[PDB]
Amino acid sequence: VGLFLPEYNPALTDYWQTLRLRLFNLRHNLSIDGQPLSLAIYAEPTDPK
Amino acid sequence: AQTLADYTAERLSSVLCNWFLANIQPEGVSLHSRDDLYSYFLIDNQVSSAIKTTRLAEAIAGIQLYINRALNRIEPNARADVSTRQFFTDWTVNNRY
Amino acid sequence: LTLSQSNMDTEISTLTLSNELLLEHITRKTGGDSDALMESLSTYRQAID
Amino acid sequence: WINYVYNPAGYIVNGEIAPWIWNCRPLEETTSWNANPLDAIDPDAVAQNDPMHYKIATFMRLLDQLILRGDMAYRELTRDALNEAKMWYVRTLELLGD
């Protein structure tokens, strides 16, 4: 056998990828574009010597 | 202290999910992944600690998930007669608060 | 479940509810206490985590 | 409108769940009504030769609608909207499989 093999459907893989990305964004408290929705902190340095 | 508590909660959740998946099996349900636990117990154990909710809201979400799974014949042995009530017939309008 | 105002209004983390449910199930299975469960988990080897 | 062709929850006939899966009879029985589909470049002709591709097309349309609903719910940023979007995404994922 030296023939070629069948290929998956790209559209379904696209659906799976989109679902995975959306679920990951939802579970980690991020917007639909990946922008974080929580403010960070600065941890100001405590003076010089 | 709050950040440490969140980290501890996440680690404990992962450890407990792994232990339950490894040691305990229910009577007639086979589950092999964390998503299976999510679908079985109707509560998401993979969420980050940042998100917040109320008990009634999570109960509503769990029951809605259970109804959606049962209606679409994903979970076997669903009662056919019960699934034809007036409430489920209009599920296109009762699935959201 | 009790349909009280406090249950309706009080904020809480989903991870807390999931952990409490899983802990209840595990303690019911092993018949021990939460502290005993943690001490046992300190030496458990038959898992990946 | 799409429930007249496919509905995962089944169809209520005379007050009971109907035994068939697809409401469109030719799709259910897979009746072919085209014998020369490769005479010209025409995806519709190929689908007519084997109506299974019509099944897959309808399924893909349903998934598209579900994902669009989820995105619309997500774009509101309200907690209830986030829960609704999560429900739509979970439903689509369960329909698709692994």
Short mmCIF file of C-alpha atoms in Angstrom, two decimals:
data_model
loop_
_atom_site.label_atom_id
_atom_site.label_comp_id
_atom_site.label_asym_id
_atom_site.label_seq_id
_atom_site.Cartn_x
_atom_site.Cartn_y
_atom_site.Cartn_z
CA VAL A 1 0.00 0.00 0.00
CA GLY A 2 1.39 3.37 -1.06
CA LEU A 3 -1.87 5.31 -1.25
CA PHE A 4 -3.07 8.36 0.67
CA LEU A 5 -5.30 8.58 3.72
CA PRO A 6 -8.56 10.47 4.34
CA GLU A 7 -8.58 13.78 6.17
CA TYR A 8 -10.72 15.19 8.97
CA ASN A 9 -13.28 17.92 8.39
CA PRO A 10 -11.74 21.31 9.26
CA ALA A 11 -15.06 22.92 10.22
CA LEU A 12 -15.75 20.50 13.07
CA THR A 13 -12.23 20.96 14.44
CA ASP A 14 -12.87 24.70 14.26
CA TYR A 15 -16.02 24.23 16.34
CA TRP A 16 -14.13 22.21 18.94
CA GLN A 17 -11.34 24.79 19.13
CA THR A 18 -13.81 27.65 19.55
CA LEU A 19 -15.68 25.79 22.29
CA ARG A 20 -12.47 25.00 24.16
CA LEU A 21 -11.26 28.60 23.97
CA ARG A 22 -14.61 30.02 25.12
CA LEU A 23 -14.88 27.59 28.03
CA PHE A 24 -11.32 28.36 29.12
CA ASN A 25 -12.01 32.10 29.01
CA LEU A 26 -15.21 31.67 31.01
CA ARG A 27 -13.64 29.51 33.71
CA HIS A 28 -10.73 31.91 34.37
CA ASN A 29 -12.74 35.14 34.80
CA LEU A 30 -11.83 36.77 31.50
CA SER A 31 -13.76 38.70 28.88
CA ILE A 32 -14.63 37.19 25.51
CA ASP A 33 -11.42 38.68 24.05
CA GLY A 34 -9.15 37.45 26.84
CA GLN A 35 -9.01 40.78 28.65
CA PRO A 36 -8.83 40.22 32.42
CA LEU A 37 -11.82 41.40 34.44
CA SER A 38 -10.08 41.82 37.81
CA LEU A 39 -7.79 44.63 38.93
CA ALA A 40 -4.28 43.72 40.07
CA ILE A 41 -2.14 45.14 42.89
CA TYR A 42 1.04 47.20 42.82
CA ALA A 43 3.02 46.09 45.92
CA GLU A 44 4.60 49.48 46.52
CA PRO A 45 8.27 49.31 47.61
CA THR A 46 8.96 50.17 51.24
CA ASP A 47 11.40 53.13 51.07
CA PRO A 48 15.19 53.21 50.50
CA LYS A 49 18.03 53.01 53.03
CA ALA B 1 -4.15 35.69 53.22
CA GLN B 2 -6.99 35.88 50.70
CA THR B 3 -4.68 34.98 47.81
CA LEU B 4 -3.27 32.06 49.80
CA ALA B 5 -6.81 30.87 50.56
CA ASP B 6 -7.72 30.96 46.87
CA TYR B 7 -4.62 28.98 45.91
CA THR B 8 -5.31 26.43 48.65
CA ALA B 9 -8.90 26.06 47.47
CA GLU B 10 -7.79 25.37 43.90
CA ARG B 11 -5.18 22.80 44.92
CA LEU B 12 -7.58 21.06 47.30
CA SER B 13 -10.25 20.92 44.60
CA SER B 14 -7.89 19.24 42.15
CA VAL B 15 -6.68 16.74 44.76
CA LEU B 16 -10.20 15.86 45.90
CA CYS B 17 -11.45 15.39 42.34
CA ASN B 18 -8.54 13.07 41.57
CA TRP B 19 -9.08 11.06 44.76
CA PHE B 20 -12.81 10.68 44.13
CA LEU B 21 -12.24 9.63 40.52
CA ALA B 22 -9.69 7.06 41.66
CA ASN B 23 -11.35 5.50 44.71
CA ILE B 24 -15.16 5.84 44.49
CA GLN B 25 -17.53 4.64 41.79
CA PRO B 26 -21.32 5.08 42.06
CA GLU B 27 -23.83 2.25 41.69
CA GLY B 28 -24.48 2.34 37.95
CA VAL B 29 -22.59 5.30 36.49
CA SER B 30 -19.15 5.15 34.88
CA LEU B 31 -17.15 8.38 35.05
CA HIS B 32 -13.57 8.83 33.87
CA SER B 33 -12.77 12.56 33.88
CA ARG B 34 -13.31 15.84 35.69
CA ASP B 35 -15.95 16.84 33.13
CA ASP B 36 -17.80 13.64 34.02
CA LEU B 37 -17.79 14.79 37.64
CA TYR B 38 -19.10 18.19 36.52
CA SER B 39 -21.93 16.56 34.59
CA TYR B 40 -22.74 14.18 37.44
CA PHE B 41 -22.71 16.50 40.45
CA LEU B 42 -24.08 19.50 38.50
CA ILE B 43 -21.36 21.85 39.75
CA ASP B 44 -18.17 23.03 38.06
CA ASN B 45 -15.01 22.03 39.91
CA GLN B 46 -12.65 23.43 37.26
CA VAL B 47 -13.54 27.09 37.81
CA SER B 48 -11.02 29.54 39.19
CA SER B 49 -11.51 30.81 42.72
CA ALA B 50 -12.13 34.38 41.53
CA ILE B 51 -15.73 33.84 40.40
CA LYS B 52 -18.55 34.24 42.92
CA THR B 53 -22.14 33.04 43.10
CA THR B 54 -25.05 32.38 45.46
CA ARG B 55 -26.49 29.06 46.57
CA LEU B 56 -29.82 29.56 44.80
CA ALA B 57 -28.11 30.57 41.55
CA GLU B 58 -25.88 27.50 41.53
CA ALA B 59 -28.82 25.24 42.38
CA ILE B 60 -30.74 26.74 39.46
CA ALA B 61 -27.78 26.22 37.14
CA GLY B 62 -27.37 22.61 38.24
CA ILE B 63 -31.04 21.77 37.74
CA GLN B 64 -31.07 23.45 34.33
CA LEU B 65 -28.01 21.43 33.31
CA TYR B 66 -29.66 18.22 34.50
CA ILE B 67 -32.84 18.96 32.56
CA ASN B 68 -30.89 19.78 29.40
CA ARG B 69 -28.90 16.55 29.68
CA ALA B 70 -31.98 14.40 30.32
CA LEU B 71 -34.20 15.92 27.64
CA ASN B 72 -31.73 15.50 24.76
CA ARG B 73 -31.42 11.75 25.45
CA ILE B 74 -27.81 12.10 26.59
CA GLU B 75 -28.51 10.35 29.89
CA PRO B 76 -30.19 6.99 29.15
CA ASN B 77 -33.37 5.59 30.66
CA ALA B 78 -35.11 8.96 30.87
CA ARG B 79 -38.83 8.67 31.56
CA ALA B 80 -40.66 9.34 28.30
CA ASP B 81 -44.07 10.09 29.83
CA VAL B 82 -42.70 12.66 32.28
CA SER B 83 -40.73 14.47 29.57
CA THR B 84 -43.96 15.45 27.75
CA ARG B 85 -45.39 17.68 30.48
CA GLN B 86 -46.51 21.22 29.74
CA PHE B 87 -43.43 22.65 31.45
CA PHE B 88 -40.93 20.82 29.25
CA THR B 89 -42.96 21.40 26.09
CA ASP B 90 -42.29 25.14 26.50
CA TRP B 91 -38.64 24.59 27.44
CA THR B 92 -37.68 27.14 24.79
CA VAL B 93 -39.03 29.82 27.15
CA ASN B 94 -38.54 28.23 30.60
CA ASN B 95 -34.81 27.54 30.27
CA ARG B 96 -33.89 31.11 31.29
CA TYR B 97 -35.00 33.05 34.35
CA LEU C 1 -32.14 23.53 50.73
CA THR C 2 -33.66 26.42 52.68
CA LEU C 3 -35.25 29.21 50.64
CA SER C 4 -34.19 32.05 52.91
CA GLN C 5 -33.06 35.57 52.09
CA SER C 6 -29.51 34.90 53.28
CA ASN C 7 -29.17 31.94 50.92
CA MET C 8 -30.44 34.14 48.09
CA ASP C 9 -28.23 37.18 48.74
CA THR C 10 -24.96 36.05 50.34
CA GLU C 11 -22.02 35.88 47.94
CA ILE C 12 -19.81 32.79 47.90
CA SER C 13 -17.26 31.09 45.66
CA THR C 14 -18.31 28.11 43.56
CA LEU C 15 -15.10 26.29 44.46
CA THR C 16 -16.16 26.42 48.11
CA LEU C 17 -19.47 24.69 47.37
CA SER C 18 -17.83 22.05 45.18
CA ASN C 19 -15.16 21.36 47.80
CA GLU C 20 -17.73 21.05 50.58
CA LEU C 21 -19.80 18.60 48.52
CA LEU C 22 -16.80 16.46 47.61
CA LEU C 23 -15.54 16.53 51.20
CA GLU C 24 -18.94 15.39 52.46
CA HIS C 25 -18.93 12.48 50.01
CA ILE C 26 -15.38 11.41 50.88
CA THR C 27 -15.97 11.62 54.63
CA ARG C 28 -19.18 9.61 54.28
CA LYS C 29 -17.27 6.95 52.34
CA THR C 30 -14.29 6.65 54.69
CA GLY C 31 -16.29 7.34 57.85
CA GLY C 32 -13.60 9.63 59.25
CA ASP C 33 -13.10 13.31 59.99
CA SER C 34 -11.81 16.04 57.69
CA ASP C 35 -8.54 16.32 59.63
CA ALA C 36 -8.08 12.55 59.51
CA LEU C 37 -8.73 12.70 55.77
CA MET C 38 -6.04 15.35 55.31
CA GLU C 39 -3.56 13.36 57.40
CA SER C 40 -4.28 10.27 55.30
CA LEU C 41 -3.85 12.27 52.09
CA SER C 42 -0.46 13.44 53.37
CA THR C 43 0.88 9.93 52.65
CA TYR C 44 -1.30 8.75 49.75
CA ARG C 45 0.74 7.48 46.80
CA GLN C 46 -1.74 5.72 44.47
CA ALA C 47 -2.64 8.81 42.44
CA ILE C 48 -0.98 11.48 40.34
CA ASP C 49 -1.83 14.57 42.42
CA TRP D 1 -38.58 26.66 12.10
CA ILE D 2 -35.62 24.27 12.19
CA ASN D 3 -37.44 21.94 14.59
CA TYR D 4 -39.60 20.83 11.65
CA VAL D 5 -36.58 18.92 10.31
CA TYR D 6 -34.40 17.99 13.29
CA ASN D 7 -34.92 18.16 17.04
CA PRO D 8 -32.70 16.27 19.52
CA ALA D 9 -35.50 16.22 22.10
CA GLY D 10 -37.85 14.30 19.80
CA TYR D 11 -41.27 15.19 18.45
CA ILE D 12 -44.58 15.05 20.31
CA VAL D 13 -47.12 13.10 18.25
CA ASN D 14 -50.56 12.38 19.75
CA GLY D 15 -49.12 13.19 23.18
CA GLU D 16 -46.21 10.74 23.04
CA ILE D 17 -42.62 10.89 21.85
CA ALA D 18 -42.38 9.78 18.24
CA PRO D 19 -40.09 6.80 17.51
CA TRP D 20 -38.31 8.41 14.56
CA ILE D 21 -35.21 10.58 14.85
CA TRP D 22 -35.43 12.91 11.85
CA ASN D 23 -38.73 14.57 10.97
CA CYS D 24 -37.86 14.78 7.25
CA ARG D 25 -38.84 11.42 5.79
CA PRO D 26 -36.33 11.20 2.89
CA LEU D 27 -33.50 12.00 5.31
CA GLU D 28 -34.77 9.38 7.76
CA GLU D 29 -34.96 6.70 5.07
CA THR D 30 -31.92 7.99 3.10
CA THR D 31 -33.62 8.08 -0.29
CA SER D 32 -31.33 8.99 -3.18
CA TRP D 33 -32.85 10.99 -6.04
CA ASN D 34 -29.91 11.72 -8.33
CA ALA D 35 -27.87 9.29 -10.42
CA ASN D 36 -25.29 11.55 -12.13
CA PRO D 37 -23.98 13.99 -9.51
CA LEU D 38 -20.47 14.40 -10.94
CA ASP D 39 -21.50 15.71 -14.37
CA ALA D 40 -20.70 19.23 -13.15
CA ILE D 41 -19.26 20.97 -10.10
CA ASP D 42 -22.31 21.16 -7.84
CA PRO D 43 -22.27 20.43 -4.09
CA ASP D 44 -26.06 20.27 -4.03
CA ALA D 45 -26.04 17.50 -6.64
CA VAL D 46 -23.57 15.47 -4.58
CA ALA D 47 -25.67 15.96 -1.45
CA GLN D 48 -28.75 14.86 -3.39
CA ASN D 49 -26.96 11.69 -4.47
CA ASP D 50 -26.32 10.81 -0.81
CA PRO D 51 -28.63 12.69 1.59
CA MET D 52 -26.37 11.99 4.59
CA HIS D 53 -24.54 15.21 3.79
CA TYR D 54 -27.86 16.98 4.28
CA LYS D 55 -27.99 15.50 7.79
CA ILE D 56 -24.50 16.82 8.50
CA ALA D 57 -25.36 20.24 7.06
CA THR D 58 -28.44 20.54 9.28
CA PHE D 59 -26.43 19.49 12.33
CA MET D 60 -23.77 22.08 11.54
CA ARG D 61 -26.42 24.79 11.16
CA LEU D 62 -27.84 23.88 14.57
CA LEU D 63 -24.38 24.08 16.15
CA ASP D 64 -23.82 27.47 14.53
CA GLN D 65 -27.05 28.78 16.01
CA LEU D 66 -26.11 27.51 19.47
CA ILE D 67 -22.65 29.09 19.36
CA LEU D 68 -24.11 32.40 18.17
CA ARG D 69 -26.58 32.39 21.06
CA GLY D 70 -23.72 31.73 23.46
CA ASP D 71 -21.62 34.58 22.08
CA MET D 72 -24.56 36.99 22.24
CA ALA D 73 -25.15 36.07 25.88
CA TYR D 74 -21.43 36.38 26.66
CA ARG D 75 -21.17 39.89 25.27
CA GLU D 76 -23.43 41.34 28.06
CA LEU D 77 -20.95 40.85 30.97
CA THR D 78 -23.78 40.40 33.50
CA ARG D 79 -23.42 37.42 35.83
CA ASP D 80 -26.72 35.93 34.68
CA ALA D 81 -25.65 36.51 31.08
CA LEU D 82 -22.38 34.71 31.82
CA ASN D 83 -24.29 31.76 33.28
CA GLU D 84 -26.53 31.64 30.21
CA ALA D 85 -23.51 31.69 27.89
CA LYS D 86 -21.93 28.89 29.91
CA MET D 87 -25.11 26.85 29.58
CA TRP D 88 -25.21 27.33 25.81
CA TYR D 89 -21.55 26.37 25.40
CA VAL D 90 -21.93 23.29 27.61
CA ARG D 91 -24.98 22.19 25.62
CA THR D 92 -23.12 22.56 22.33
CA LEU D 93 -20.12 20.65 23.68
CA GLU D 94 -22.33 17.82 24.91
CA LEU D 95 -24.05 17.63 21.53
CA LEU D 96 -20.72 17.49 19.69
CA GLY D 97 -19.08 14.84 21.84
CA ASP D 98 -15.36 14.34 22.38
#
